[PDB]
Design a protein around this ligand. Structure first.
Ligand SMILES: *C[C@@](*)(O)[C@H](CCCNC(N)=[NH2+])NC(=O)[C@@H]1CCCN1C(=O)[C@H](N)Cc1ccccc1
Ligand SMILES: *[C@H]1O[C@H](CO)[C@@H](O)[C@H](O)[C@H]1NC(C)=O
Ligand code: NA
Lengths: 282, 41, 259
């Protein structure tokens, strides 16, 4: 009736710890922020693009778990602390007819009973769990060649290819975005490149080899994708886009000139490519 | 119950998973829904 | 999805993923109902309290997926939105009533073994199936669980998630909340006294709540993930949009050009 189980406890924080000496409220509200700041950081280590692979999962679940088991703790802490807050709020009203003040909701309420024994233990687990991760990875990389990250030079070499090819598609895009008959299919191309390329400002890092491989084919395909749909023919050679060589607003000349050449490319191009395409359309 | 000319096609075939249904392949937690339908008989 | 589970690639073809263009960010799940119409939770696009009000330009859906991370050229099709349809009598100021929205794809897509549409509840199948006790299916790439670590989002799975949740009876639903309920929404989940558990969570919304008709082995999207107080908490249940009851509106808007 009044008995509940659900002991999804996997946190590395000692039970007999919350019985310590509560942190001075003023110095408390800060340690809390510290905490949050760790989860924030740790989580990020996952959303790190470089890990979006099939070999990393088993090692990412590992962390993710470590991170939730700790967060669970704090939740259970707040979830408990509130129940004790409600009461001491009630017994507060039965002393002040002036309910000038209002009760805070679970979402407004913050943790007010946090020993230091608790704080350290949490961080010593996350600071831990992570170092654990770095290991899992460094390992998975000594066993999967292309995954081992590039060198400031190397990465620059790949990244440069991709960015060129990418800028080579923006030639196609601009080329037909104005072509009323293909306006859409162009847009989907452009928007599809931006999608893979990564946020303009801080694009996906072309770390390891594999990433270099895929990115090209994903961009490679996305380009063929355009032609299949407009039927148009892929030229075995299109110029790249130099933001300074032909700006749509700063070098119109070389801009429209770029498009002329391109359209001509697609106009004189043969149906030879359709037999090589990345995606087997059909 | 729409006219393709306004709702598009797919209406007719709706609900059948080409990699499960139209291949007699049940998914890891399908019967689970049928467990909620009839607890007896 | 909380208490979720890795879907089986090709488990929810009609599962769309409302993605935002820039800054590249995942917004909600969705539902493909034909080859040019996709259905989602009205508030995924507009919701003034969070300064939310996206438009066709601001985003683009992505059907036939599994991995939220990498692009899947083999199966993934990316499409731009032509016109957007939010519900008139949609009430956000107070409680997310008529929280449903229709999206018309800029170009009709080609259905593959991964981009197949779902069916809409039936006037009879609605009754035969929408009964407290019956389990439906919820899928999405939402928060893997609830976190005190508020002020942080990125807490989603890598692959598509699936959880099957039973329907709760009107009384309870209304009871478990101080938020006003409406016949235009239903609540699903597990009762505390029960054993199993689960729930859809944030960044799950738009996604479908389907059921499979035993009278014709087909999947009908009974509801849309809409709201809830917290996630998989104990005592409250998850609220979805009662899609069937709104099917009147849907029709009214698709079969528009004509009358
Ligand atoms: C739009 C979404 O993805 C999300 C779905 C949440 C599902 N939650 C659970 N527990 N199954 N919806 C929301 O976050 C909605 C929209 C804005 C506020 N909101 C909530 O669910 C609040 N938690 C409660 C609420 C506040 C104001 C008005 C209605 C509901
Ligand atoms: C944004 O969408 C339209 C733009 O005209 C506007 O009417 C609407 O009120 C806006 N949404 C919000 C945040 O209220
Ligand atoms: Na629950």
């Amino acid at each position: 009736m009044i008995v509940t189980k659900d002991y999804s406890k996997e946190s590395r924080v000692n039970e007999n710890s919350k019985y310590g000496t509560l942190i001075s409220d003023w110095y408390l509200k800060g340690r809390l922020t510290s905490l949050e700041s760790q989860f924030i950081n740790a989580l990020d280590i996952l959303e790190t693009y470089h890990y979006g692979e099939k070999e990393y999962k088993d090692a990412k679940d590992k962390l993710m778990t470590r991170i939730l088991g700790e967060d669970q703790y704090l939740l259970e802490r707040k979830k408990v602390q509130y129940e004790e807050y409600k009461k001491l709020y009630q017994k507060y009203k039965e002393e002040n007819p002036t309910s000038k003040l209002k009760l805070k909701t679970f979402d407004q309420y913050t943790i007010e009973d946090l020993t230091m024994r608790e704080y350290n233990e949490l961080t010593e687990s996350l600071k831990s769990a992570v170092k654990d991760f770095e290991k899992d990875v460094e390992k998975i990389e000594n066993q999967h060649h292309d995954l081992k990250p590039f060198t400031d030079e190397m990465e620059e070499k790949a990244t440069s290819r991709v960015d060129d090819l990418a800028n080579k598609a923006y030639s196609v895009y601009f080329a037909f975005v104005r072509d009323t008959q293909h306006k859409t299919e162009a847009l989907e191309l452009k928007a599809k490149v931006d999608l893979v390329l990564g946020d303009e400002d801080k694009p996906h890092r072309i770390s390891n080899e594999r990433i270099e491989k895929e990115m090209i084919k994903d961009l490679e395909s996305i380009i063929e994708d355009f032609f299949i749909e407009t039927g148009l023919n892929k030229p075995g050679n299109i110029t790249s886009y130099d933001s300074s060589k032909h700006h749509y607003k700063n070098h119109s000349e070389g801009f429209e000139a770029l498009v002329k050449e391109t359209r001509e490319a697609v106009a004189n191009a043969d149906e030879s490519w359709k037999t090589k395409t990345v995606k087997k359309y059909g | 119950f729409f006219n393709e000319k306004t709702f598009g096609a797919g209406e007719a075939d709706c609900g059948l998973r080409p990699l499960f249904e139209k291949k007699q392949v049940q998914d890891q937690t399908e019967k689970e829904l049928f467990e909620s339908y009839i607890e007896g008989r | 999805i909380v208490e979720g589970q890795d879907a089986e690639v090709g488990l929810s073809p009609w599962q769309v993923m409302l993605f935002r263009k820039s800054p590249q960010e995942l917004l909600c799940g969705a539902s493909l109902i034909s080859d040019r119409w996709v259905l989602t939770a009205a508030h995924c696009l507009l919701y003034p309290p969070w300064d939310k009000n996206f438009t066709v330009d601001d985003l683009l859906v992505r059907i036939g997926k599994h991995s939220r991370t990498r692009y899947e050229r083999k199966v993934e099709k990316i499409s731009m939105l032509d016109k957007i349809y939010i519900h008139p009598r949609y009430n956000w100021k107070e409680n997310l009533d008529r929280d449903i929205a229709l999206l018309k794809l800029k170009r009709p897509i080609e259905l593959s073994d991964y981009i197949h549409p779902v069916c809409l509840p039936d006037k009879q199948t609605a009754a035969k199936l929408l009964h407290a006790g019956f389990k439906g299916r919820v899928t999405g790439w939402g928060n893997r669980r609830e976190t005190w670590t508020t002020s942080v989002a990125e807490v989603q799975p890598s692959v598509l998630q699936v959880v099957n949740l039973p329907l709760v009876e009107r009384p309870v639903c209304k009871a478990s909340t101080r938020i006003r309920i409406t016949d235009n929404m239903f609540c699903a989940g597990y009762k505390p006294g029960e054993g199993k558990r689960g729930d859809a969570c944030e960044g799950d919304s738009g996604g479908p709540f389907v059921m499979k008709s035993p009278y014709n082995n087909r999947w009908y999207q009974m509801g849309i993930v809409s709201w809830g107080e917290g996630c998989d908490r104990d005592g409250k249940y998850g609220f979805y949009t009662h899609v069937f009851r709104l099917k009147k509106w849907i029709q009214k808007v698709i079969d528009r050009l004509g009358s």
